Every structure is written in C-alpha cells, then in structure tokens.
Design a protein around this ligand. Structure first.
Ligand SMILES: Nc1ncnc2c1ncn2[C@@H]1O[C@H](COP(=O)(O)O)[C@@H](O)[C@H]1O
Ligand SMILES: Nc1ncnc2c1ncn2[C@@H]1O[C@H](COP(=O)(O)O)[C@@H](O)[C@H]1O
Ligand SMILES: [Zn+2]
Ligand SMILES: [Zn+2]
Lengths: 175, 178
DNA sequence: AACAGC
DNA sequence: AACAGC
C-alpha cells in the first residue's frame, strides 16, 4: 500500500524538514507516542536492518549524532529522558531512527503494540545497532519479536505490571 | 455500616445443616460461592470484628482455626491430592473475620472475574500462618498498603507463573495443572 | 469518471 | 421475620 511510503514522501517535503544535511533528514513523527518524537532517515535509502552492512556504519553513527543534536536544538531545556533506536519489524518502509522522549505522554499512544514497540527488546537501541555493525558487520535480530508486542503492559521506570492502557497512562503520571 | 447482606456468614454458621464442623471454639461451613472444588470458611463463635482488632488474646484461637482447617482438609479432601492454602482476605466484604480454606485447583464456575482471582493469588490473601506469626511477634496484624491496587494486577497462573489476558483463557490454562 | 503514479 | 407477587 502507498501508506507505507509516507516517510519518503514527508522527508522530501521542505515543510516537514526539522533538520537536513547531505546525509540525513529529520521529521517529526506524524503520530507521536511522546511529547517529543522524531524520525531520522537517510537520503540513500536502506530497505531493512537485514540489508545493513559495514558500509552503512558511518551513516548510522551520523543518524545517531543528528538525533542527539535535534534533542539539543528543539528540546534542550527539557529534563526529559530520550532513547534512540529502531523497530525490529517496522511497518513504514525505509529504515528510520526513532528519537523519542520517555514520558510517553501522547494521545497517539493507544494500544499495547505501541507501548511494547518502544519498551521491549523489539526496540533495538541505536548504540547497540552501531556496535553490531562495527564488530560483527551486520545487524542480528533475535527471534520472537512479534510475541514481544503482545506482552502485558509493564512500566519502563519501575517495572510494575498494569492491566490496561488507560491505567498505564495514569501510572506514568507518578514518574 | 453496610446492610443486612453482610451478616450472611453469622446467619449461615448458626444453621446446623451448613456446619461441616463444630466445637466449643469454631465452626466450619462450605463457602456458598466456592472458588474451587473445595472451599471452606472457619469462623469463631466469639466473633472478631476485623484483622485490625486482632490482639494477642486471639492468638490461640487463630491457631485453633488453622488446625481445624487442616483437619477438614484431610477429613473431606484427603483422597483428592489437591494442594490447599489457608489465609484471610486483607479487606473482606462479609462481616466477622473468617479463615479461608481453599483448594488450589480454582476449578469452579463461581470464579468469574479478576477480583476473585487476585483475592486468593496476591498479597491480598494473607496466609493463616503469617497472620499467626505477626500476632506472635508483634501482638497485632498489620495490613500493608495498596491492597485495592493488587486486585487489578493482570492474571497470573499460581502454578507456572504465566500471565493470562482474560478469565476464560485462565480457566483454559489451568486445565494443564489438573 | 476512473485511475496510475517507475 | 424472610419473601414472593403486585
Ligand atoms: N507520514 C508520516 N510522517 C511522519 N511519521 C509518520 C508518518 N506515517 C507514519 N509515521 C510514523 O512512523 C512510525 C512508523 O512505525 P514503525 O514502522 O514501527 O517504525 C510511527 O511512529 C508513525 O506514527
Ligand atoms: N451465606 C454464605 N455462606 C457461606 N459463604 C458465604 C456466604 N456469603 C458469602 N460467602 C462467601 O464468603 C466470602 C466473602 O468474601 P470475603 O469477605 O472477601 O471473605 C466469599 O468467599 C463468599 O463466597
Ligand atoms: Zn512505574
Ligand atoms: Zn500455569
């Protein structure tokens, strides 16, 4: 479906370009799952994590550095915590780096898949991906990622199990 | 002060037809809505308002209630080989403190919602022995905070610790341990 | 009105 | 006193 190309379309639209250089583009996540949620995409598209090889190393490092720069330039005075990583089995085409604040306070965060895709090992940290390409030369993704998306809701700050999304969002207010 | 319905245990325990066991100290009745194949309530003739009211004077009575519970198990469920737990609900709904004696099959149609499950499978369920130890060491029973929150915890099998998303799936899962 | 978009 | 039946 044409919906899966949204990232390539949006990153080519100057009105959506939070940041741009000769290597990458940054856009706001159209349906953000937190107060701050950006996506970093390279101009030279990569199909999936399986296609990543050592030639992509510096680019991945650049995507990480740019993500941290966007935090400084557009959320510097914030005390929030941030994580940078990739979804093991994404839905939108063209690999993209998630840069998202750990409040997870947003109406677009609506279901269990949303939560677990940022708060389970389904969320592959950027620094860990960079490490695999630097040493092994490829990105290895363990099995069972679809099951992680169906796990009961667990708080990422205190590890408490919650029974529903609404009760989770109320719990997050304590942190 | 709650309505007349909360006195059902006092009315039922005085009915000889409901008495599974009786002595000068305690009485045993079958739970009217059992949450397992075997489910009894042990109540003293000298009623206790709540766990907060328990003092060292009730210690021997509490141990007698426990021992009687253990005897009812062997007398009426000895051939079942089922596991049992003895404890009190931290925040009961029926008046008059009563000791739960329940088999761990949890195979019953009266078990219908999460509150039922977590009332017997979280810290909401205070083991009889633990209650006895507190009264022994400290002379009173202390209920920890956050009990209403425990009743909302996702369903967890008490045998293999697996988390289940619904009651019907839990009942189906429990088959594997019978 | 219908529909491909390289 | 509980409790259908209105
Ligand atoms: N047109 C778009 N522009 C920006 N972000 C988008 C767009 N469409 C989807 N997204 C986001 O991209 C992410 C795709 O998820 P995933 O495929 O798991 O990486 C989600 O956070 C979506 O909200
Ligand atoms: N008339 C009754 N006779 C025997 N058990 C009852 C009766 N009414 C309620 N119960 C049980 O007493 C318990 C009351 O809940 P709790 O106050 O949490 O111990 C539940 O297990 C009920 O099924
Ligand atoms: Zn928490
Ligand atoms: Zn189990």
């Amino acid at each position: 479906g044409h919906w899966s190309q949204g990232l390539k379309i949006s990153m080519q639209d100057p009105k959506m370009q939070v940041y741009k250089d000769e290597q990458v583009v940054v856009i706001k996540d159209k349906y953000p799952k937190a107060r701050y949620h950006w996506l970093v995409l390279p101009w030279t598209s990569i199909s999936s994590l399986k296609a990543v090889a050592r030639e992509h190393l510096e680019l991945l490092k650049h995507m990480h550095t740019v993500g941290e720069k966007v935090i400084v330039d557009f959320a510097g005075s914030s005390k929030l915590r941030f994580r940078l990583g990739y979804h093991a089995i994404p839905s939108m085409s063209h690999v993209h780096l998630h840069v998202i604040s750990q409040d997870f306070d947003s109406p677009c965060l609506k279901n269990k898949k949303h939560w677990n895709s940022f708060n389970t090992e389904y969320f592959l940290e950027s620094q860990a991906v960079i490490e695999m390409v630097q040493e092994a030369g490829r990105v290895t993704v363990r099995d069972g990622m679809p099951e992680l998306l169906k796990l009961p809701l667990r708080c990422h700050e205190c590890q408490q199990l919650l029974p529903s999304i609404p009760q989770l969002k109320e719990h997050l207010r304590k942190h």
